[PDB]
Amino acid sequence: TNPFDNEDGSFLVLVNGEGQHSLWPAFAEVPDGWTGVHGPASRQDCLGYVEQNWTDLRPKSLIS
Amino acid sequence: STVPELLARQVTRAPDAVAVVDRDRVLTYRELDELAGRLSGRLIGRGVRRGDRVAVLLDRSADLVVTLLAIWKAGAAYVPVDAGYPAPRVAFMVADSGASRMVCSAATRDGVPEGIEAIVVTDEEAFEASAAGARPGDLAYVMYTSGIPKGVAVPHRSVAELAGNPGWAVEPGDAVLMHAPYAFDASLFEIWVPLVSGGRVVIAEPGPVDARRLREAISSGVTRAYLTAGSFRAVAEESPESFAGLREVLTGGDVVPAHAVARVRSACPRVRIRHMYGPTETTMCATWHLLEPGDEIGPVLPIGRPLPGRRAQVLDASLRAVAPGVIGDLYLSGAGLADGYLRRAGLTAERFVADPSAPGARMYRTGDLAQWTADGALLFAGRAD
Ligand SMILES: CC(C)C[C@H](N)C(=O)O
Ligand code: NA
């Protein structure tokens, strides 16, 4: 099963310098330039965090 | 960059070259720019501001091209709506996209949903020509998937990375047939690629482009044409000689069997055949395979190699890069990524994920399987489903 699509997997939420959020499998090393802000937690929990916390899809550089 | 910037270069270099051919009507680059500036002035005059979304409900025409550029000049993004869509999809797309105004024609006026401003493109109004200007990070368009359709938000930089890509090899002498729905991102090739290259857009006559109409267009001077996979397969099996005279035929989207390409090459030794692959989320196409004149395809039609400026990765279930000949998940990175899905932050975070190969960058999860060849081409290996 694809690791990003495993509804039973353990996940993080990562954010980059542009404020963009990413789901991430908790078993995998966090890529450079990204910071974990939530998890390990269920996939639905992480997606709910993104829905609640990523309110503006525009990259931060655009807004500033 | 932005497509308006690339187009402005062509207006400066050759203002009197033909830009758009629509039946009797012919627009030069200068004429296209001037008309778009006037419609842009009408939009600014109404208070349209940077980042606003303007829906578009028009039949393909020179006015369509003018309208799209005009929305861009006003600092806004276009939301293309096919005039053949049923009313519920039109209404959903307009509301979902946050479009507050809709450009239409006399013929399509009744298709504007109630409560949305109808702007009839042929109406003349007391506003001066003006442009706010397009900027690379700003929204250029919102195009909807074939699924509940999702709104893909694409910035100017990504459209320009696609349209201005040197690999298209479109020249000022080229004439590209325009017939795909402008609500589909193949229209980026049919409209913007020729205009940023100095060539001309030839608006197809109303109705579907079949083999007979393709032959007639080629006789009138069309040099390049895109066909959907379904149409290409049908013409390749039924009348492959109908591509004769084209400099290049392009296709992609759905499955194209190698046999279909082989038939066209057999009938048309000199036509370049470009097979293209890519989701709307990465701006029309991310990889392509070009069969040069005289060359034979062989048993498998690759989806090919990333476009210049783009990267592809084939990773296993632990996100490790696999060796050639091993099937894995296909990820697309580098140029051309959308910002994400409108109103769907979670879905965006689920498919535009962190890219381990480039600091701070994202890659789009295609949901497709692929394998590398030893020489760096990609073979499609089905859906991860
Ligand atoms: C233009 C085609 C190569 C692919 C198109 N972007 C699609 O998603 O169907
Ligand atoms: Na996709």
Author numbering:
A (entry chain D): 2 to 65
B (entry chain A): 9 to 155, 159 to 396
Manuscript excerpt for this entry:
In this work, we have sought to understand the evolutionary history of lipid II targeting glycopeptide antibiotics (GPAs), a vital class of nonribosomal peptides used in the clinic for the treatment of resistant bacterial infections and exemplified by vancomycin (Van) and teicoplanin (Tei). Since ANC1-3 domains display polydisperse elution profiles in size exclusion chromatography, we instead turned to the characterisation of an Acore construct of the Hpg accepting A1 domain from Tei biosynthesis (A1tei), which possesses a homologous pocket to ANC1. The MbtH-like domain Tcp13 also exhibits the anticipated fold, containing a 3-stranded antiparallel β-sheet and an α-helix adjoining the centre of the sheet.
To understand the effects of the evolutionary mutations seen in the binding pocket of the ANC A-domains we then mutated the residues of the substrate binding pocket of A1tei to those seen in A1ANC2 and A1ANC3. Comparing the A1ANC3 pocket to A1ANC2 shows further refinement of the pocket through additional substitutions (L287M and V295M), which serve to improve van der Waals contacts in the binding pocket for Leu. ANC2 and ANC3 were both selective for Leu, with ANC3 showing 1.7-/3.8 fold higher kcat value for L-Leu/D-Leu. In terms of A1-domain evolution, our results indicate how the alteration of the Hpg binding pocket was driven through three crucial changes in the binding pocket that together eliminated Hpg binding whilst enabling the acceptance of Leu.
